[PDB]
């Protein structure tokens, strides 16, 4: 059933698009000390999943923050400074976010190729006999 392929590729593109938006929010918040919720932003990472047990779609089961410590900065005159003058910043790593941007885009585009190629197979089956 090549229609099941469209579900797998379609679920893959959804998963890769979630990771790209997560990467976008990490780059936009690599220097954000404050937040709406009173807790410092932590680098986010969507968790992919596979229900292997034929076609196994990839599903996003939630966003999980990185456990690395928040990068402390010595800013004693800052209004949000603690008793020792340290302000805490997100633990976003620039190099690892660029790799995620490259990986998410390439993984997104290769699933379009599979969906397009699988589309041709179904159309060719419609021509069988006739």
């Amino acid at each position: 059933s090549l229609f099941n392929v469209f579900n797998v590729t379609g679920s893959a593109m959804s998963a890769e698009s979630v990771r790209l938006n997560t990467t976008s929010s990490n780059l936009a918040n690599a220097d954000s000390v404050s937040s709406s919720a009173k807790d410092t932003y932590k680098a986010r990472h969507a968790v992919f999943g596979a229900e292997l047990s034929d076609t196994v779609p990839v599903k996003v089961m939630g966003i999980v923050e990185s456990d690395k410590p928040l990068s402390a900065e010595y800013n004693p005159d800052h209004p949000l400074a603690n008793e020792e003058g340290y302000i805490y910043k997100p633990n976003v790593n620039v190099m690892e976010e660029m790799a995620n941007m490259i990986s998410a885009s390439r993984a997104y585009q290769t699933n379009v190729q599979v969906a397009d190629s699988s589309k041709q197979m179904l159309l060719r089956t419609l021509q069988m006999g006739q």
Binding site: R19, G49, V64, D67, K68, E96
Partner: protein
């Protein structure tokens, strides 16, 4: 069983770099 984890940069690291949360790394084996 279900297998899962963070993809991309964080997982493609040596375990010493503790970027991956401990419980998420557990999921990468098997679950049910």
């Amino acid at each position: 069983n279900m297998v899962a984890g963070i993809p991309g940069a964080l997982s493609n690291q040596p375990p010493a770099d503790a970027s991956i949360p401990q419980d998420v790394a557990q999921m990468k084996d098997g679950s049910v």
